[PDB]
């Protein structure tokens, strides 16, 4: 991730800095220690010492307040390059004027190695320059330091030391790109979720009043979106239902492209939306021929009438401005009524709030009978329109009738590796530890031996668990394990992991067991041993921090104070210095490592999850689009901006409860009980949706007691095992299955049955969406109002199907008995066929 471990380097300037600078004031004390050793007691006969330590430590100042330089940016690996050279050469420098016998060589050694764990850290260089300088400084230390196995004990040293640096390299620069990783990709989660928040937004208000909808988001029911992973109907009356149906509506729509006619339809349809916003006019939804609105129902109003004919009269002025401007014979009748409604939202597919009155069927019924130009209104819409505009009792032709007009890298992992680490340079401290009998073939201790290989076969155990843990081999039993890590929590990790990292001092003593304060050889390279040994204690910093510190502390303190009293006098005191400077220097470091790990551990919990948030919030809009679309024009909008196409032949079905309104009875609050009850239904018919077999059949939508299915339509691809045109077998077993479906729920319709009558059509159709910021896709042709007028002239208990659907749903099995030949608006007195053979009397 080449420019992505830029970016890293990008943001991650300051902790470097700040670890780089306070490992400066580290030096500062260091050279300062030195000095203060070499002036108080000793080494007082040459001076020459103490010039080299205070140019360092003005370097270093310089360093220090340099780092805040603006031009820093890209000016920091060569620094922290030429900075360990510097200190390198410092170091070899004190080093050389050595092997006279006055001082120890461990304590140039301990700097040595505490430097090198400094470049270590912070200095951030090329994984494999910096283990090739880092080991070429060991080696040609290890050289100068000349000046037949005591020297392979040292060069073991500069390995081991090794070892752990490279490591805790490697782990601490993975813990930042993985750290910065997360951190991005927790942003980018919030930003792509609150888009998918305001795309699932307008999806709400596109299928929801911004009344109703902005009721429901902030969730006064929790119900509601319960279902969406409670409904509340008001009987608000004194409203304007307004409708407007298309004349010349079969003409305008018989030889278009079937899509830019739905196109200029949406352009109409756009003015019509503005027409509604600004006369404050709730519009409702357009069925076929017919736009249609209500007047300020959810905020209640008084000049709803008003508004109402304004606004139909703006709409006028727009069909007249389209049909001069795309020189068009079209408008439309217009017919409004006024009264009580109740409102409300049922149903779980493709449903919406709605209303329903008879105030509703009367502005229906008068529009029907109405003209273009006048709309025809009834008596309450007279009664308080105060004729301020164009009164005209517009009488029927053929009821108070009026016109108006106008006017990698886990928590194991790490654990796995720092494990590994451990065991092998224990294991290699063992050797150097050991190696002390040279010539001595006989060990005379036999706790060294003994604690080594207890301590191994620790090791080892520690090794075979995570490596089972991880690798699952599962040998023995699992289940054990099962139980058992149940134990290893938080706490008895870090104890157990505690005595596994605490373990080498212990194991060096073992030789400690053995008299060295006579041997000052012995004795220094003892030193050696155990500071080389505390070093390590940085490691496991996904344990403990106080505690582990702590720790590490009173090991390292313990057996020198112990030989500060077994006794070669104050060079205990300059190396129990010295071992306190490293002390508190491990204590920060790893103090800071372990605060990089809580930290990645808090990321990545509020990093998964966003992850979580969004996908709940990406896969709730998608349901609630499943709710409002299809598949099919899904994938025609995710690829496009629209989508239209003249579908020649598709049945349509309609469905009607003949006694609803009277078992609707209002000796209740609207008897919303009853209500209730309907959605009932309506969720078992949306049940019967829910059949695989029934999944290609497009339910369309519903008012009230209408409801409308169609298919054929989705049928894009017809496999040779299926015919083009059985959707009108399938549609019927719907048909006859909800029939059955009502027939039981009137059995649980507590004293009371009731029945519909349903009208069946097929054949030339169109399918076309509306709604862009809006969303509106509907079907039209001569099919719909034809099975429209078939239920309206249906009857009960018995399916009235036209003649050709009658004929083509025969042949698949369904016996029809002839109803008779009905008058149908455009096709005149048409041939009419009841399904049920005399179910009823006949």
């Given at each position: 991730?080449?420019?992505?471990?830029?970016?890293?380097?990008?943001?991650?300037?300051?902790?470097?800095?700040?670890?780089?600078?306070?490992?400066?004031?580290?030096?500062?004390?260091?050279?300062?220690?030195?000095?203060?050793?070499?002036?108080?007691?000793?080494?007082?006969?040459?001076?020459?010492?103490?010039?080299?330590?205070?140019?360092?430590?003005?370097?270093?100042?310089?360093?220090?307040?340099?780092?805040?330089?603006?031009?820093?940016?890209?000016?920091?690996?060569?620094?922290?390059?030429?900075?360990?050279?510097?200190?390198?050469?410092?170091?070899?420098?004190?080093?050389?004027?050595?092997?006279?016998?006055?001082?120890?060589?461990?304590?140039?050694?301990?700097?040595?190695?505490?430097?090198?764990?400094?470049?270590?850290?912070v200095m951030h260089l090329p994984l494999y320059l910096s283990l090739i300088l880092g080991v070429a400084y060991s080696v040609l230390f290890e050289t100068f330091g000349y000046h037949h196995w005591e020297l392979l004990s040292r060069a073991l040293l500069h390995l081991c030391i090794h070892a752990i640096g490279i490591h805790l390299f490697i782990m601490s620069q993975v813990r930042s790109r993985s750290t910065f990783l997360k951190v991005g990709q927790s942003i980018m989660h919030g930003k792509d979720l609150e888009v998918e928040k305001a795309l699932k937004e307008?999806?709400?208000?596109?299928?929801?009043?911004?009344?109703?909808?902005?009721?429901?988001?902030?969730?006064?029911?929790?119900?509601?979106?319960?279902?969406?992973?409670?409904?509340?109907?008001?009987?608000?009356?004194?409203?304007?239902?307004?409708?407007?149906?298309?004349?010349?509506?079969?003409?305008?729509?018989?030889?278009?492209?079937?899509?830019?006619?739905?196109?200029?339809?949406?352009?109409?349809?756009?003015?019509?939306?503005?027409?509604?916003?600004?006369?404050?006019?709730?519009?409702?939804?357009?069925?076929?021929?017919?736009?249609?609105?209500?007047?300020?129902?959810?905020?209640?109003?008084?000049?709803?009438?008003?508004?109402?004919?304004?606004?139909?009269?703006?709409?006028?002025?727009?069909?007249?401005?389209?049909?001069?401007?795309?020189?068009?014979?079209?408008?439309?009748?217009?017919?409004?009524?006024?009264?009580?409604?109740?409102?409300?939202?049922?149903?779980?597919?493709?449903?919406?709030?709605?209303?329903?009155?008879?105030?509703?069927?009367?502005?229906?019924?008068?529009?029907?009978?109405?003209?273009?130009?006048?709309?025809?209104?009834?008596?309450?819409?007279?009664?308080?329109?105060?004729?301020?505009?164009?009164?005209?009792?517009?009488?029927?032709?053929?009821?108070?009738?009026?016109?108006?007009?106008?006017?990698?890298?886990?928590?194991?992992?790490?654990?796995?590796?720092?494990?590994?680490?451990?065991?092998?340079?224990?294991?290699?401290?063992?050797?150097?530890?050991?190696?002390?009998?040279?010539?001595?073939?006989?060990?005379?201790?036999?706790?060294?031996?003994?604690?080594?290989?207890?301590?191994?076969?620790?090791?080892?155990?520690?090794?075979?668990?995570?490596?089972?843990?991880?690798?699952?081999?599962?040998?023995?039993?699992?289940?054990?394990?099962?139980?058992?890590?149940?134990?290893?929590?938080?706490?008895?990790?870090?104890?157990?992991?505690?005595?596994?990292?605490?373990?080498?001092?212990?194991?060096?003593?073992?030789?400690?067991?053995?008299?060295?304060?006579?041997?000052?050889?012995?004795?220094?390279?003892?030193?050696?041993?155990?500071?080389?040994?505390?070093?390590?204690?940085?490691?496991?910093?996904?344990?403990?921090?106080?505690?582990?510190?702590?720790?590490?502390?009173?090991?390292?303190?313990?057996?020198?104070?112990?030989?500060?009293?077994?006794?070669?006098?104050?060079?205990?005191?300059?190396?129990?210095?010295?071992?306190?400077?490293?002390?508190?220097?491990?204590?920060?470091?790893?103090?800071?490592?372990?605060?990089?790990?809580?930290?990645?551990?808090?990321?990545?919990?509020?990093?998964?999850?966003?992850?979580?948030?969004?996908?709940?919030?990406?896969?709730?809009?998608?349901?609630?689009?499943?709710?409002?679309?299809?598949?099919?024009?899904?994938?025609?909008?995710?690829?496009?901006?629209?989508?239209?196409?003249?579908?020649?032949?598709?049945?349509?079905?309609?469905?009607?409860?003949?006694?609803?309104?009277?078992?609707?009875?209002?000796?209740?609050?609207?008897?919303?009980?009853?209500?209730?009850?309907?959605?009932?239904?309506?969720?078992?018919?949306?049940?019967?949706?829910?059949?695989?077999?029934?999944?290609?059949?497009?339910?369309?939508?519903?008012?009230?007691?209408?409801?409308?299915?169609?298919?054929?339509?989705?049928?894009?691809?017809?496999?040779?095992?299926?015919?083009?045109?059985?959707?009108?077998?399938?549609?019927?077993?719907?048909?006859?299955?909800?029939?059955?479906?009502?027939?039981?729920?009137?059995?649980?319709?507590?004293?009371?049955?009731?029945?519909?009558?349903?009208?069946?059509?097929?054949?030339?159709?169109?399918?076309?969406?509306?709604?862009?910021?809006?969303?509106?896709?509907?079907?039209?042709?001569?099919?719909?109002?034809?099975?429209?007028?078939?239920?309206?002239?249906?009857?009960?208990?018995?399916?009235?199907?036209?003649?050709?659907?009658?004929?083509?749903?025969?042949?698949?099995?369904?016996?029809?008995?002839?109803?008779?030949?009905?008058?149908?608006?455009?096709?005149?007195?048409?041939?009419?066929?009841?399904?049920?053979?005399?179910?009823?009397?006949?």
């Amino acid at each position: 991730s080449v420019n992505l471990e830029e970016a890293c380097m990008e943001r991650c300037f300051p902790q470097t800095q700040r670890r780089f600078r306070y490992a400066l004031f580290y030096i500062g004390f260091a050279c300062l220690l030195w000095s203060i050793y070499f002036g108080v007691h000793m080494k007082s006969k040459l001076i020459v010492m103490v010039a080299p330590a205070l140019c360092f430590l003005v370097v270093c100042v310089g360093f220090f307040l340099f780092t805040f330089t603006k031009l820093y940016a890209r000016h920091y690996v060569w620094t922290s390059l030429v900075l360990t050279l510097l200190v390198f050469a410092l170091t070899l420098a004190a080093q050389f004027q050595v092997l006279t016998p006055c001082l120890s060589q461990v304590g140039s050694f301990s700097m040595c190695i505490e430097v090198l764990f400094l470049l270590y850290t912070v200095m951030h260089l090329p994984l494999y320059l910096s283990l090739i300088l880092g080991v070429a400084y060991s080696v040609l230390f290890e050289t100068f330091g000349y000046h037949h196995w005591e020297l392979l004990s040292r060069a073991l040293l500069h390995l081991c030391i090794h070892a752990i640096g490279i490591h805790l390299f490697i782990m601490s620069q993975v813990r930042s790109r993985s750290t910065f990783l997360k951190v991005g990709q927790s942003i980018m989660h919030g930003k792509d979720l609150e888009v998918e928040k305001a795309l699932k937004e307008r999806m709400i208000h596109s299928v929801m009043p911004r009344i109703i909808a902005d009721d429901l988001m902030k969730q006064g029911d929790e119900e509601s979106e319960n279902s969406v992973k409670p409904f509340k109907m008001q009987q608000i009356e004194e409203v304007s239902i307004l409708f407007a149906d298309i004349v010349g509506f079969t003409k305008m729509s018989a030889n278009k492209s079937a899509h830019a006619l739905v196109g200029l339809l949406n352009d109409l349809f756009g003015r019509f939306d503005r027409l509604c916003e600004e006369t404050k006019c709730e519009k409702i939804s357009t069925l076929g021929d017919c736009y249609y609105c209500v007047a300020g129902c959810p905020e209640p109003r008084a000049d709803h009438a008003y508004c109402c004919i304004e606004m139909g009269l703006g709409m006028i002025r727009a069909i007249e401005q389209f049909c001069q401007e795309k020189k068009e014979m079209v408008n439309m009748r217009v017919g409004v009524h006024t009264g009580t409604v109740l409102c409300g939202i049922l149903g779980m597919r493709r449903f919406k709030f709605d209303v329903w009155s008879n105030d509703v069927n009367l502005a229906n019924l008068m529009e029907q009978l109405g003209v273009a130009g006048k709309v025809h209104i009834s008596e309450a819409t007279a009664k308080y329109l105060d004729d301020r505009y164009e009164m005209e009792d517009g009488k029927v032709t053929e009821l108070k009738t009026y016109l108006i007009a106008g006017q990698f890298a886990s928590a194991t992992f790490s654990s796995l590796l720092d494990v590994l680490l451990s065991t092998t340079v224990f294991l290699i401290l063992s050797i150097t530890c050991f190696l002390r009998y040279g010539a001595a073939s006989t060990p005379p201790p036999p706790a060294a031996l003994a604690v080594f290989g207890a301590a191994l076969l620790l090791e080892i155990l520690s090794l075979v668990v995570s490596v089972r843990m991880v690798f699952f081999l599962e040998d023995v039993m699992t289940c054990t394990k099962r139980l058992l890590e149940w134990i290893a929590g938080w706490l008895p990790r870090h104890f157990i992991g505690a005595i596994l990292v605490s373990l080498p001092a212990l194991a060096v003593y073992s030789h400690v067991t053995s008299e060295f304060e006579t041997n000052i050889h012995s004795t220094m390279f003892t030193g050696s041993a155990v500071l080389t040994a505390v070093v390590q204690y940085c490691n496991f910093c996904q344990l403990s921090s106080w505690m582990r510190s702590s720790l590490a502390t009173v090991v390292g303190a313990g057996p020198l104070l112990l030989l500060l009293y077994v006794s070669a006098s104050l060079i205990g005191q300059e190396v129990i210095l010295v071992f306190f400077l490293l002390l508190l220097l491990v204590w920060f470091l790893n103090r800071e490592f372990e605060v990089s790990y809580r930290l990645h551990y808090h990321g990545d919990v509020e990093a998964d999850l966003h992850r979580t948030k969004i996908q709940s919030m990406r896969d709730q809009a998608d349901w609630l689009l499943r709710n409002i679309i299809p598949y099919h024009v899904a994938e025609q909008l995710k690829v496009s901006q629209t989508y239209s196409k003249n579908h020649d032949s598709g049945g349509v079905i309609f469905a009607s409860i003949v006694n609803f309104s009277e078992f609707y009875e209002e000796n209740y609050e609207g008897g919303k009980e009853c209500y209730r009850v309907l959605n009932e239904l309506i969720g078992d018919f949306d049940e019967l949706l829910s059949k695989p077999d029934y999944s290609s059949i497009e339910k369309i939508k519903t008012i009230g007691a209408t409801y409308m299915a169609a298919s054929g339509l989705n049928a894009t691809q017809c496999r040779d095992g299926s015919h083009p045109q059985e959707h009108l077998q399938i549609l019927f077993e719907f048909a006859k299955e909800m029939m059955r479906v009502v027939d039981d729920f009137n059995n649980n319709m507590l004293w009371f049955n009731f029945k519909l009558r349903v009208g069946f059509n097929h054949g030339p159709l169109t399918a076309g969406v509306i709604g862009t910021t809006k969303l509106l896709y509907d079907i039209w042709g001569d099919t719909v109002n034809i099975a429209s007028r078939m239920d309206t002239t249906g009857v009960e208990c018995r399916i009235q199907v036209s003649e050709e659907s009658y004929r083509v749903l025969s042949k698949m099995g369904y016996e029809f008995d002839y109803r008779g030949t009905v008058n149908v608006k455009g096709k005149g007195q048409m041939k009419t066929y009841l399904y049920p053979k005399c179910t009823d009397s006949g």
